[PDB]
Scaffold this active site. Structure first.
Site, PDB file in Angstrom:
ATOM      1  N   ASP A  21       0.947  -1.239   0.003  1.00 16.21           N
ATOM      2  CA  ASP A  21       0.073   0.005  -0.066  1.00 16.21           C
ATOM      3  C   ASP A  21       0.905   1.372   0.288  1.00 16.21           C
ATOM      4  OD1 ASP A  21      -2.428  -1.157  -0.051  1.00 16.21           O
ATOM      5  OD2 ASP A  21      -3.105  -0.634   1.955  1.00 16.21           O
ATOM      6  N   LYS A  24       3.323   1.447  -5.266  1.00 20.72           N
ATOM      7  CA  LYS A  24       3.787   0.702  -6.541  1.00 20.72           C
ATOM      8  C   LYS A  24       2.959   0.692  -7.543  1.00 20.72           C
ATOM      9  CE  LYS A  24       4.555  -2.855  -4.060  1.00 20.72           C
ATOM     10  NZ  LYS A  24       3.812  -2.571  -2.633  1.00 20.72           N
TER      11      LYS A  24
HETATM   12  N1  LIG Z   1      -2.239  10.224  -0.238  1.00 17.96           N
HETATM   13  C1  LIG Z   1      -1.658   9.679  -1.225  1.00 17.96           C
HETATM   14  N2  LIG Z   1      -2.169   8.333  -1.251  1.00 17.96           N
HETATM   15  C2  LIG Z   1      -1.385   7.694  -2.353  1.00 17.96           C
HETATM   16  C3  LIG Z   1      -0.293   8.370  -3.143  1.00 17.96           C
HETATM   17  N3  LIG Z   1       0.017   7.226  -3.976  1.00 17.96           N
HETATM   18  C4  LIG Z   1      -0.726   6.300  -3.849  1.00 17.96           C
HETATM   19  N4  LIG Z   1      -1.766   6.675  -2.881  1.00 17.96           N
HETATM   20  C5  LIG Z   1      -2.780   5.912  -2.196  1.00 17.96           C
HETATM   21  O1  LIG Z   1      -2.471   4.668  -1.408  1.00 17.96           O
HETATM   22  C6  LIG Z   1      -3.089   3.540  -1.477  1.00 17.96           C
HETATM   23  C7  LIG Z   1      -2.239   2.396  -2.188  1.00 17.96           C
HETATM   24  O2  LIG Z   1      -1.883   2.627  -3.534  1.00 17.96           O
HETATM   25  P1  LIG Z   1      -1.176   1.478  -4.386  1.00 17.96           P
HETATM   26  O3  LIG Z   1      -0.610   2.000  -5.508  1.00 17.96           O
HETATM   27  O4  LIG Z   1      -2.502   0.671  -4.771  1.00 17.96           O
HETATM   28  O5  LIG Z   1      -0.497   0.690  -3.549  1.00 17.96           O
HETATM   29  P2  LIG Z   1       0.416  -0.537  -3.762  1.00 17.96           P
HETATM   30  O6  LIG Z   1       1.692  -0.303  -3.147  1.00 17.96           O
HETATM   31  O7  LIG Z   1       0.519  -0.845  -5.278  1.00 17.96           O
HETATM   32  N5  LIG Z   1      -0.115  -2.017  -3.253  1.00 17.96           N
HETATM   33  P3  LIG Z   1       0.117  -3.541  -2.903  1.00 17.96           P
HETATM   34  O8  LIG Z   1       1.459  -3.333  -1.895  1.00 17.96           O
HETATM   35  O9  LIG Z   1      -0.854  -4.181  -2.463  1.00 17.96           O
HETATM   36  O10 LIG Z   1       0.836  -3.768  -4.062  1.00 17.96           O
HETATM   37  C8  LIG Z   1      -4.025   3.866  -2.794  1.00 17.96           C
HETATM   38  O11 LIG Z   1      -5.328   4.254  -2.082  1.00 17.96           O
HETATM   39  C9  LIG Z   1      -3.408   5.214  -3.474  1.00 17.96           C
HETATM   40  O12 LIG Z   1      -4.832   6.387  -3.645  1.00 17.96           O
HETATM   41  C10 LIG Z   1       0.072   9.495  -2.870  1.00 17.96           C
HETATM   42  O13 LIG Z   1       0.960  10.021  -3.500  1.00 17.96           O
HETATM   43  N6  LIG Z   1      -0.529  10.202  -1.839  1.00 17.96           N
HETATM   44 MG   LIG Z   2       0.164  -2.930  -6.063  1.00 20.34          MG
END
Ligand SMILES: Nc1nc2c(ncn2[C@@H]2O[C@H](COP(=O)(O)OP(=O)(O)NP(=O)(O)O)[C@@H](O)[C@H]2O)c(=O)[nH]1
Ligand SMILES: [Mg+2]
Length: 405
Positions: A21, A24
């Protein structure tokens, strides 16, 4: 089918790793939008095009590695976007097995968490030589004192695992806000918006800090298989990254590990991303149409090789570092007869640890040389790094030292 692939620039494989989260997939998506403003030849992939699986939707995480394609003025990139969740580490490992360099994503709000450390350690063991850091979610952190704390924490963390922690680029930005702007204006270019521009800093860092690798197109074809699926009209496709050599349509290849006997068959198509190649070259991330073989006959962990070039092995000697309790390792020592999982490139297999006449027990922290006998044959080679995992933690890192059987 698809359009035919043109070799304008040199091709580098990157990908995103980091704790769950932290951002990435949002960065991966922001990367395709940002570059597509500069090049019409980049298909943009939005967040939901990447976590598109029904399971991923159900858990609200990434489970599968996704591959996307972008390019800068300098090179062409395949990008692999791995899961962060602990349940899915073996998917991060096969995705990192295809990387020439990684983009470690750490969230400024949280800083380094347990899978920031574990991903750094595993990416090393699977052959990732360079790491660029994206500090994400900086829109959530106003105290710029914190930003310098995390940046230093992450540098210490990389230094611990033999990376150039002090020299690594660390770009700070928000992937979500760069992604929102590219949505509001799809043509946003360099200079226009501060957030988009930090995605451009990251791309500049990739171009220049992560070097174009020396690939062996002159050694025999070896391609570790990452995935197999069926294209319903065409047939069975094995995907992976070509470690070394070349494939042309019409070539035969043996399917080598994880089974009793090997199998030969004929390559019937090569594709990189959507597009057709007549030839696949060391370094390419390709789909490989295989003749007369169902997707129940090739599997993740086998390699395709020029026939008679490699022989699968079962028993080897290894030098192993066993992680300490404080790196996420196991707490108590283990004995001869221990049966963990072993990870080489994209393959994972059970092995039995065989301690020497006169070693009763191995403890966390021990460096140690034992013999391992795997329960299936696997393409091995001396000096091949690997990782040991068991019960849901990484318990060791090692190098194969001498093949005995
Ligand atoms: N406040 C904020 N939230 C962000 C930012 N980048 C991503 N997020 C939020 O953080 C959450 C996770 O993003 P996500 O891209 O899905 O994470 P992940 O690292 O890909 N996921 P996993 O480890 O399950 O792969 C999302 O709700 C996204 O909107 C950012 O720059 N600022
Ligand atoms: Mg992801």
């Amino acid at each position: 089918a698809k359009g035919e692939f043109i070799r304008t620039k040199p091709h580098v494989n990157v990908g995103t790793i980091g704790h769950v989260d932290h951002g990435k997939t949002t960065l991966t998506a922001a990367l395709t939008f940002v570059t597509a403003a500069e090049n019409p030849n980049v298909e943009v992939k939005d967040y939901g095009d990447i976590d598109k699986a029904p399971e991923e939707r159900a858990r609200g995480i990434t489970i599968n590695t996704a591959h996307v394609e972008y390019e800068t003025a300098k090179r062409h990139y395949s990008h692999v976007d791995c899961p962060g969740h602990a349940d899915y580490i073996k998917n991060m490992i096969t995705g990192a097995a295809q990387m020439d360099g990684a983009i470690l994503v750490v969230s400024a709000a949280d800083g380094p968490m347990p899978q920031t450390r574990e991903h750094i350690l595993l990416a090393r063991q699977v052959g990732v030589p360079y790491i660029v850091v994206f500090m994400n979610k900086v829109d959530m952190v106003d105290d710029p004192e914190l930003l310098d704390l995390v940046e230093m924490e992450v540098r210490d963390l990389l230094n611990q695992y033999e990376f150039p922690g002090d020299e690594v680029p660390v770009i700070r930005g928000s992937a979500l806000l760069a992604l929102e702007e590219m949505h509001k204006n799809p043509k946003t270019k360099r200079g226009e918006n501060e957030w988009v521009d930090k995605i451009w800093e990251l791309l500049d860092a990739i171009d220049e800090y992560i070097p174009t690798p020396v690939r062996d197109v002159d050694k025999p074809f070896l391609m570790p298989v990452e995935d197999v699926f069926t294209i319903t009209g065409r047939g069975t496709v094995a995907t992976g990254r070509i470690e070394r050599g070349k494939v042309k349509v019409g070539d035969e290849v043996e399917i080598v590990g994880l089974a009793p006997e090997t199998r030969k068959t004929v390559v019937t198509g090569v594709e990189m991303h959507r597009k057709t190649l007549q030839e696949g070259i060391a370094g390419d991330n390709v789909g490989l149409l295989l003749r007369g073989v169902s997707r129940e006959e090739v599997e993740r962990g086998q390699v395709l090789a020029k026939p008679g070039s490699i022989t699968p092995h079962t028993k080897f000697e290894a030098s192993v570092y066993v992680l300490k309790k404080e790196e996420g390792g196991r707490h108590t020592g283990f004995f001869s007869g221990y049966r963990p999982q072993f990870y080489f490139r994209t393959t994972d297999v059970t092995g039995v640890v065989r301690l020497p006449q006169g070693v009763e027990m191995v403890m966390p922290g021990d460096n140690v040389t034992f013999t391992v006998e795997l329960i299936k044959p696997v393409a091995l080679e001396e000096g091949l790094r690997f990782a040991i995992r068991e019960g849901g933690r990484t318990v060791g890192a090692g190098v194969v030292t001498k093949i005995l059987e």
